[PDB]
Design a protein around this motif. Structure first.
Motif, PDB file in Angstrom:
ATOM      1  N   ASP A 139       2.197  23.258 -15.482  1.00 33.09           N
ATOM      2  CA  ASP A 139       2.930  24.484 -15.200  1.00 33.09           C
ATOM      3  C   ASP A 139       4.254  24.450 -15.948  1.00 33.09           C
ATOM      4  O   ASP A 139       4.710  25.465 -16.476  1.00 33.09           O
ATOM      5  N   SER A 140       4.862  23.270 -15.994  1.00 32.70           N
ATOM      6  CA  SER A 140       6.094  23.064 -16.743  1.00 32.70           C
ATOM      7  C   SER A 140       5.836  23.173 -18.242  1.00 32.70           C
ATOM      8  O   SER A 140       6.711  23.589 -19.003  1.00 32.70           O
ATOM      9  N   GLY A 193       2.198  20.193 -11.759  1.00 36.81           N
ATOM     10  CA  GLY A 193       3.520  20.641 -12.156  1.00 36.81           C
ATOM     11  C   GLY A 193       3.803  20.362 -13.618  1.00 36.81           C
ATOM     12  O   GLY A 193       4.532  21.108 -14.270  1.00 36.81           O
TER      13      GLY A 193
END
Lengths: 284, 254, 229, 69, 126
Positions: free
Chosen positions: B248-249, B245
Motif C-alpha cells: 500500500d505504501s 502496508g
C-alpha cells in the motif's frame, strides 16, 4: 502401421478434437445473445399487426395490397440458410423440406421462385438447381433489416405484378437448445388472425394521406419484419445446433483416439519384439 | 548434487554393456538399465539422526544428514513415454518438466504446471511460501488451458477476460532472468502480486516487469522487517498485515 | 493359512515382481520373448498366484497394486496378471475431489464374484441396480449442464435424485482415519449394505436430505443423521 | 401511431424511399445473377474452421483403425 | 523446359499448401479458390497414358497451361484433358513451327509470341 506416425496421427485427432471443443464452447457463448435480439424483434412486428388488422377492417376490401386470396400459378420462397457450416443438418433438413414442398407445387404445374439468404443456401441451390431471383449473404452474426429490404422488395414486386400468388418464409424455428424445427410459414397473403381481426372499437385514426396508402406501407413494413425475425431466429437456432453438433464432433474424435491408441500399442509391441529378436538371433 | 544428463549416462552404459556382449533390452539398453538409475538415486535421501550417530561414532549427535538429487533427462520431441525417461520418473519423487514451446517463446523459466509436480511438495516448502503458493500452482495451469481456447474466441466475457489478464500477468511476473537468484523475500512480490493483485491495477504487462524490479528495492529501504522472513521463513497473521502496508505504501512510489 | 486363519497378502507392486523376473532371466542368458519379456513369465506368474488361494484348512486373499505399462493392458505384464485377478478396485481422483472417501469408482471397479449367482440374487440385483441408477446419472449430467434440469422427465430427475444420494452413501469413514480425522467411522456387514442401498434406490429414504448419507455406517446411522440436522 | 392512452413510434432502421429501395432491390438481383463470394463477419469460426480443415485433412485415420462404413 | 517448368513448380507448390481446404472448398473466397482450381487442373494435366511418350511439344501443353489459364476457361477437369489431346494434334496441323521447337530445344521470345497465338488461334476449334 508404424508407431512413429500412428503417434502424430493420434496427436492430430487429439488436436481436431480440441478444436471442435473450442467451437462448441464459442457457439455456446454466442448462443445467449442470439435469443436476446430474437426477442427484441417481436414488439415492432406484433404492434404493427394490430394496427394492420384494425385499419384492415374497413379499407382492405376495396384494395387488398395483400389481404385477399387468389388463384395460385406461381409461388415465392424466401429461404433462410446460414452463412456458416458445422451445425449438423440444420440446413439440409430445411432444404429437404422445401424441396419436397416445391415438388407438390411443380406437380400441379406451378413454378417456384426463390429469394436466397445466406451463403450455404446459395451454394446448395447453385448445385441442385433452382430459380434464385435475388440473394443476400454475409450478414453472419450481424443481421439487419437494411440488408433484407433488397430481396424482399424483389419478391413483393413480383406479387404486385401478379408474377407470384403466394409467398413463403423458410427458416428454422428455435424450440429449445436441442430442438430446431424446419418451418415453412406463409406470409403474404396475409393470413388470417382471429385474434387481431375479430374485435374492434369505437374510435378511429385520422390518416393524413388516405388510410389506403398507410395500409400499404404498413403491409410492406410488416412482411419485412416477418422475414427479419425469421432470419434472426434461424440464427439463434444455428448457434445451438452448432454447439450441439460440435460436442458430437468432440466425442467422435475421442472415440477415434481410443481406437488409434490400440492400433498404436500393437505396433509399439511388434516394433520392440522384432528389434530385440533380430539382434539376438543375428548374434547367434 | 545434480547429474547433468544422466540420460547420456544411459547411452554410455549401453555402449559398455553392448561391447561386453550382454543381452539387450527395450531400446537396446541392457536389462538392468533401470537398476542403474535405481541404485544411484536411491542413494540420495535424508538419513535420520540415529544413523548419523552410529556412522559418525558419537562424533555428531543431534544433526541429521541428507543428500538431495537433481537428475537431468533429455526427451526427444517432448515424448516422456520413452523408456529411460519413464524409468527415472518411476524412481524420482516428482519432476520439473521444462516445455520447449514455452522456453523459446520468451517465457524462460519454462516450467509446465499440471505436468510438473513435487511429490513431497508441501512439507518441503517454507512455512510462509506454503500459504502464498497454494493457489498459484493450479490456477496458473488453468490460464494456459484457457489461453488456448482464447485463440479462436475473441469477444469473451469480462469474467474470463479478467482471468486471462491475471494469468498472463502472473506468468510474466513468475518469469525471471538467469543468473539472478532470488531471496525467500521473493514471496513478497510472489504473494502480494497475487494476493490483492497490486499489479492488476497498473496491470498492463510491460510494467508488470519493471514493477517487480522496483518493489524489490523499496523494501530494501526497510529490510529488517523483511530479513526477518528470510531467517525464520515463517508467516503469521501479523506478518501478513505488515506486508500489506509495504505494498500500500508502494502505491506511492515508482 | 495352514495355521487355520484367513489372511491378507498385499504385494507392493506385482508388476515390479514380473519385471524383476525379466532381469534375472536376462542375466541367465535366456532368450527374449514377446515384447522382450521372459519366456518363463507365463509360469512365473502361475506359481506366485496359484499359491494364494483358499484351502480347506485356511485361506490367503491378496490385494496387489498393479501397473499397466504405457496404459496398454495388452502388454504381457498386465495381460498375464489379469488372467489371474478375481477383482479390481479402482481409485478415482475425481471421485476423491468431491469428497466421497473410499475413492473407489463404483463403475470401472469390477469383481467376477458378483457377476454370477454366487453372492446371491438379492445382492447381485442390488449391485446391478446401483450400476444403472449411478450410470444413468452421468448421461443426464451433461444433458443438464447444457439444458434445463426441469425438462428432465419425472422418473429421471428422481433417478438423478436417488443416484445423487447413493453416491454420498457409499462413502465411509475409516478407523485408521480417526487419527487423521477425529470421526470414529465403522464397519458395515454385507447385509446392512444391501438393505441400505436396496432400501434407498427402490422407493424410500427419499425424504432424507442428500447430506444425510455422507460418511456413515448402516442406513439407520444415516436416518439418525437426518434428525441431527 | 397515437391511440386511446398509447402512442408508439414504429421507426425505420434506415432511411427508406422508393428511390433508395429500388437501389437495394437491383443490387440483390445483381448479386444473384453472378455467384460471387462475400465475407460473413465471424472470425472465430473462420480461423477455427481452417485449423479444423488442416488438422482433419490427410489423416489415414479411418483406414488405420478397422471401421465399417 | 527450364523456363516454362518454373511456373508449374510453384503453381503445384501452392496447390500443395491449400490441399487441406479442398474438403472445405466453397468456404473460401475466390482469391484463393482460383489458386486451388489452377492446382487441380495442373495436376490433372500431369498425367499420361502408359505407352504414349510426349514430344517436347508437351512443352506447348505444359508451358502454356501455366502461361495463361487457357485451362482457366472451360476448366472443368473432365475437359481439362480432352483439350490436351486436341491441342496436341491441331499443332500437327501447322507443325513446321513445331518440329522447329523440337530440334532446337530452345525458346526465346519470338517462339513464345508464336506460342501465345497458337492457343488463341486454338479456341477457334474443337
Amino acid at each position: 502401421a508404424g508407431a512413429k506416425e500412428i503417434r502424430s496421427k493420434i496427436a492430430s485427432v487429439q488436436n481436431t478434437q480440441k478444436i471442435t471443443k473450442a467451437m462448441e464452447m464459442v457457439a455456446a457463448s454466442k448462443m445467449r445473445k442470439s435469443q436476446d435480439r430474437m426477442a427484441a424483434s417481436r414488439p415492432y412486428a406484433e404492434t404493427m399487426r394490430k394496427v394492420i388488422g384494425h385499419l384492415a377492417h374497413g379499407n382492405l376490401e376495396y384494395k387488398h395490397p395483400y389481404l385477399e386470396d387468389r388463384d395460385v400459378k406461381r409461388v415465392g420462397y424466401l429461404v433462410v440458410s446460414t452463412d456458416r457450416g458445422l451445425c449438423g443438418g440444420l440446413n439440409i433438413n430445411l432444404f429437404k423440406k422445401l424441396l419436397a414442398e416445391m415438388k407438390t407445387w411443380t406437380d400441379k404445374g406451378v413454378q417456384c421462385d426463390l429469394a436466397m439468404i445466406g451463403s450455404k443456401g446459395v451454394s446448395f441451390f447453385n448445385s441442385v438447381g433452382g430459380n434464385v431471383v435475388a440473394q443476400v449473404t454475409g450478414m453472419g452474426d450481424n443481421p439487419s433489416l437494411s440488408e433484407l429490404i433488397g430481396p424482399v422488395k424483389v419478391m413483393l414486386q413480383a406479387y404486385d405484378e401478379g408474377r407470384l400468388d403466394k409467398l413463403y418464409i423458410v427458416s428454422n424455428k428455435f424450440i429449445n437448445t436441442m430442438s430446431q424445427v424446419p418451418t415453412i410459414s406463409q406470409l403474404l397473403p396475409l393470413p388470417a388472425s382471429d385474434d387481431d381481426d375479430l374485435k374492434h372499437k369505437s374510435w378511429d385514426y385520422l390518416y393524413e394521406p388516405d388510410p389506403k396508402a398507410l395500409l400499404d406501407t404498413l403491409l410492406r413494413r410488416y412482411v419485412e419484419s416477418q422475414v427479419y425475425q425469421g432470419v434472426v431466429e434461424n440464427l439463434a437456432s444455428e448457434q445451438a445446433a452448432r454447439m450441439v453438433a460440435m460436442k458430437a464432433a468432440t466425442d467422435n474424435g475421442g472415440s477415434l483416439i481410443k481406437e488409434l491408441q490400440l492400433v498404436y500399442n500393437k505396433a509399439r509391441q511388434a516394433s520392440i519384439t522384432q528389434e530385440l529378436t533380430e539382434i539376438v538371433s543375428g548374434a547367434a | 548434487i545434480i547429474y547433468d544428463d544422466l540420460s547420456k549416462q544411459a547411452v554410455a552404459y549401453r555402449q559398455i554393456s553392448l561391447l561386453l556382449r550382454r543381452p539387450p533390452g527395450r531400446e537396446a539398453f541392457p536389462g538392468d538399465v533401470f537398476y542403474l538409475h535405481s541404485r544411484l538415486l536411491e542413494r540420495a535421501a535424508r538419513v535420520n539422526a540415529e544413523y548419523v550417530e552410529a556412522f559418525t561414532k558419537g562424533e555428531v549427535k543431534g544433526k541429521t544428514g541428507s543428500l538431495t538429487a537433481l537428475p537431468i533427462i533429455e526427451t526427444q520431441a517432448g515424448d516422456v513415454s520413452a523408456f529411460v525417461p519413464t524409468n527415472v520418473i518411476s524412481i524420482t519423487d516428482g519432476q520439473i518438466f521444462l516445455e520447449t514451446n514455452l522456453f523459446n517463446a520468451g517465457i524462460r523459466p519454462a516450467v509446465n504446471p499440471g505436468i510438473s509436480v513435487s511429490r513431497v511438495g508441501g512439507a518441503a516448502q517454507t512455512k510462509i511460501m506454503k500459504k502464498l503458493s497454494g493457489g498459484i500452482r493450479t490456477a496458473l495451469a488453468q490460464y494456459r488451458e484457457l489461453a488456448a481456447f482464447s485463440q479462436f474466441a475473441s469477444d469473451l466475457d469480462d469474467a474470463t477476460r479478467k482471468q486471462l489478464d491475471h494469468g498472463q500477468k502472473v506468468t510474466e511476473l513468475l518469469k525471471q532472468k538467469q543468473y539472478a537468484p532470488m531471496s525467500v523475500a521473493q514471496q513478497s512480490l510472489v504473494l502480494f502480486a497475487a494476493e490483492r493483485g497490486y499489479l492488476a491495477d497498473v496491470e498492463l504487462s510491460k510494467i508488470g516487469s519493471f514493477e517487480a524490479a522496483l518493489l524489490a528495492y523499496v523494501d530494501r529501504d526497510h529490510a529488517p522487517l523483511m530479513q526477518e522472513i528470510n531467517q525464520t521463513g515463517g508467516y503469521n497473521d501479523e506478518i501478513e498485515g505488515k506486508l500489506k502496508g509495504i505494498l500500500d505504501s508502494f502505491k506511492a512510489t515508482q | 493359512r495352514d495355521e487355520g486363519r484367513d489372511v491378507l497378502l498385499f504385494v507392493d507392486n506385482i508388476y515390479r515382481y514380473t519385471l524383476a523376473g525379466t532381469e534375472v532371466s536376462a542375466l541367465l542368458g535366456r532368450m527374449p520373448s514377446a515384447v522382450g519379456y521372459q519366456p518363463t513369465l507365463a509360469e512365473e506368474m502361475g506359481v506366485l498366484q496359484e499359491r494364494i488361494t483358499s484351502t480347506k484348512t485356511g485361506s490367503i486373499t491378496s490385494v496387489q497394486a498393479v501397473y499397466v505399462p504405457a496404459d496398454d493392458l495388452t502388454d504381457p505384464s498386465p495381460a498375464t496378471t489379469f488372467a489371474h485377478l478375481d477383482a479390481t478396485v479402482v481409485l478415482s481422483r475425481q471421485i476423491a475431489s468431491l469428497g466421497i472417501y473410499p475413492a473407489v469408482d463404483p463403475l470401472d471397479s469390477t469383481s467376477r464374484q458378483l457377476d454370477p449367482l454366487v453372492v446371491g440374487q438379492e445382492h447381485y440385483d442390488t449391485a446391478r441396480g446401483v450400476q444403472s441408477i449411478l450410470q444413468r446419472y452421468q448421461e443426464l449430467k451433461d444433458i443438464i449442464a447444457i439444458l434445463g434440469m426441469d425438462e428432465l422427465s419425472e422418473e429421471d430427475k428422481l433417478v438423478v435424485a436417488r443416484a445423487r444420494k447413493i453416491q454420498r452413501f457409499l462413502s465411509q469413514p475409516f478407523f485408521v482415519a480417526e487419527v487423521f480425522t477425529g470421526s470414529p467411522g465403522k464397519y458395515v456387514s454385507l447385509k446392512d449394505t444391501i438393505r441400505g442401498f436396496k432400501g434407498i434406490m427402490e422407493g424410500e429414504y427419499d425424504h432424507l436430505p442428500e447430506q444425510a448419507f455422507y460418511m456413515v455406517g448402516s442406513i439407520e446411522e444415516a436416518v439418525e443423521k437426518a434428525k441431527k440436522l | 401511431e397515437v391511440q386511446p392512452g398509447n402512442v408508439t413510434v414504429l421507426a425505420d432502421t434506415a432511411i427508406r424511399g422508393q428511390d433508395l429501395d429500388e437501389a437495394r432491390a437491383m443490387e440483390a438481383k445483381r448479386k444473384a445473377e453472378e455467384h460471387i463470394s462475400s465475407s460473413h463477419g465471424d472470425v472465430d469460426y473462420a480461423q477455427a474452421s481452417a485449423e479444423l480443415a488442416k488438422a482433419i485433412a490427410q489423416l489415414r485415420v479411418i483406414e488405420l483403425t478397422k471401421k465399417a462404413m
